[PDB]
Design a protein around this ligand. Structure first.
Ligand code: OOF
Lengths: 230, 12
C-alpha cells in the first residue's frame, strides 16, 4: 500500500532532521583532494566521528516519542547505535555518485587511511553491498532511525516501549521499498539483513580504532563516551 | 554516567 498523509508528514519531518548533517560532497572532497598520513587520517576520523555523534543526538531527540523514553533507556539507545549509525552514514557517502574514477580514488584513499586490513575487506564488502541496494535518501534516513530505535539494545529496561517507537518507522520503510523497488519484493528484508551485518562492525569498533597504524590513539572525551575507548 | 551524552540529551 501507498503512504498515508500521516506517514508522508512523518517521512518529511524525518528528512528535515536527517538533512542537517554534513554534506557528503564536503567529506569526499577532503579525502579526494590530497592524500594524508595515517596520523592525519586518524585526526580527520576522530573529528568526523565527533561531529557525527553531535548531529546524531539531534536527529535522535527529534524522533517521535524518543523523549518519552526512560532516561537510562535513551542513553543505552545512543551508545548502542552511535558506531552503527556512523558506519551506515559512511556507506551512504561512499555510494554517492561521483564523476568517473573518483569512486576508485576514494576507496584507494580510505584503504590507505591507516585502518588494519582485517577491517577494510568487511567494511568495503558492506559498503558495496549497501550500494547495490540503491537506497534513496529517505531509506537511509529511516533505516538510521530504525537502527537507533532498536529494542534489542543491551541494557534496554523496557524493550516494549522502544518497539512501539520503531514500529511506525518499519512500516514506512517497507512501503518505500514496495514503492521505489517493486521489481524486488525481497528489498525490505535485504535492508533488515544489512542491519545484522552492521552490528558485527559495532562488535569490533574499539579494536579497529586501537589497531589504526599510529603511535598514539587520542580521542575527544565525547568519543571516549560513545566508543568504549581510553 | 556519560555527562556529555546526558548534556546533549537534556539540553535545549
Ligand atoms: O555524516 C558524517 O558527518 C560522517 C559520517 C561518517 C564519516 N566517515 C569518515 O570520515 C571515515 C573516514 C575518516 C578519515 C579516514 C578515511 C575514512 N570513513 C569511513 C570509516 C572507516 C573506518 C572507521 Cl573506524 C570509521 C569510518 N568509511 C568511509 C567511507 C567513505 F566513503 C567516506 F567518505 C568516509 C569514510 C564522515 C562523516
Amino acid at each position: 500500500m501507498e503512504l498515508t498523509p500521516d506517514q508522508q508528514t512523518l517521512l518529511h519531518f524525518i528528512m528535515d532532521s536527517y538533512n542537517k548533517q554534513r554534506m557528503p560532497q564536503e567529506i569526499t572532497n577532503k579525502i579526494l583532494k590530497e592524500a594524508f598520513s595515517a596520523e592525519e587520517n586518524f585526526l580527520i576520523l576522530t573529528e568526523m566521528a565527533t561531529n557525527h555523534v553531535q548531529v546524531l543526538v539531534e536527529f535522535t531527540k527529534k524522533l517521535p516519542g524518543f523523549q518519552t523514553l526512560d532516561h537510562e533507556d535513551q542513553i543505552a539507545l545512543l551508545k548502542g547505535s552511535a558506531v552503527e549509525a556512523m558506519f551506515l552514514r559512511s556507506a551512504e557517502i561512499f555510494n554517492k555518485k561521483l564523476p568517473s574514477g573518483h569512486s576508485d580514488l576514494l576507496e584507494a584513499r580510505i584503504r590507505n587511511s591507516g585502518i588494519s586490513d582485517e577491517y577494510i575487506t568487511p567494511m568495503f564488502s558492506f559498503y558495496k553491498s549497501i550500494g547495490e541496494l540503491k537506497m534513496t535518501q529517505e531509506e537511509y534516513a529511516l533505516l538510521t532511525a530504525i537502527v537507533i530505535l532498536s529494542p534489542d539494545r543491551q541494557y534496554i529496561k523496557d524493550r516494549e516501549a522502544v518497539e512501539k517507537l520503531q514500529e511506525p518507522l518499519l512500516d514506512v520503510l517497507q512501503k518505500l521499498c514496495k514503492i521505489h523497488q517493486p521489481e524486488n519484493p525481497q528489498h525490505f528484508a535485504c535492508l533488515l539483513g544489512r542491519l545484522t551485518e552492521l552490528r558485527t562492525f559495532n562488535h569490533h569498533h574499539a579494536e579497529m580504532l586501537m589497531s589504526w597504524r599510529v603511535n598514539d590513539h587520542k580521542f575527544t572525551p565525547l568519543l571516549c563516551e560513545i566508543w568504549d575507548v581510553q | 554516567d556519560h555527562q556529555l551524552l546526558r548534556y546533549l540529551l537534556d539540553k535545549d
